[PDB]
């Protein structure tokens, strides 16, 4: 049998009986499909142009102003498997979630990356790669340059995670690069919370995931 990484159980808002879909297991893929960060582009060089346009390449594209877009390449990672969750039903979405016809839930809301070797650690990142293997953060989105000069940002309504142990059940925000922040002042605010240093985006057994209309339980 393949390795089971964990299961996502949807917590329903209906007050209906818990169902039996509402559950989804994650399993080690036959070939790795995870990606990891790579080349940064500051201008529309032919290489950045490939990364966005080529559907065999992954890109995340940060919109800074009408003049400036940072395009960051995501190259293949043989150590990890990638699973995505969202409202869309398209090929990229391993687990389609639904409100419990306007939706606050993202089509491609987040990705879980699982190490393919023991102990198979799972990490959550905001946003999911669409069918063009592209992620886009628009001008209005909250973004920033980190202390080592890298791009990072938050989706519109964000991805929220509660851990069972630290390192007091308190929600934190997860950025597109897997960093952990305190909550915003309002759900869609264009201002990020304060960086939380000790905690990580590793999904512990019994972690809770919030996607703005769907709450999910992660078991290990």
């Amino acid at each position: 049998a393949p390795v089971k990484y964990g299961e996502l159980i949807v917590l329903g808002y209906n007050g209906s009986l818990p169902n039996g879909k509402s559950r989804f297991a994650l399993f080690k893929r036959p070939k790795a499909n995870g990606v990891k960060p790579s080349t940064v582009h500051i201008a529309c060089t032919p290489q950045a142009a490939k990364a966005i346009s080529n559907k065999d390449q992954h890109s995340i594209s940060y919109t800074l102003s009408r003049a400036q877009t940072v395009v960051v390449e995501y190259t293949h990672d043989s150590n990890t498997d990638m699973f995505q969750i969202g409202r869309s039903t398209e090929s990229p979405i391993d687990f389609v979630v639904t409100d419990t016809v306007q939706s606050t839930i993202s089509r491609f809301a987040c990705r879980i990356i699982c190490e393919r070797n023991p102990p198979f650690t799972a990490r959550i990142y905001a946003a999911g790669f669409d069918s063009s293997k592209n992620i886009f953060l628009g001008e209005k989105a909250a973004k920033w340059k980190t202390s080592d000069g890298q791009m990072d940002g938050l989706t519109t309504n964000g991805v929220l995670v509660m851990h069972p142990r630290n390192g007091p059940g308190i929600w934190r925000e997860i950025s597109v690069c897997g960093n952990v922040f305190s909550l915003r002042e309002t759900r869609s605010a264009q201002q990020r919370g304060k960086m939380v240093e000790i905690e990580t985006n590793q999904l512990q057994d019994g972690s809770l995931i919030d996607l703005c209309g769907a709450t999910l339980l992660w078991r290990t």
């Binding site: 409202r87 389609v96 016809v101 306007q102 939706s103 839930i105 519109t156 309504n157 869609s188």
Partner: peptide, 11 residues
């Protein structure tokens, strides 16, 4: 459709 609509801002 529902799955293709754009993601609404909560605020």
């Amino acid at each position: 459709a529902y799955e293709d609509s754009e993601t609404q801002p909560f605020d």
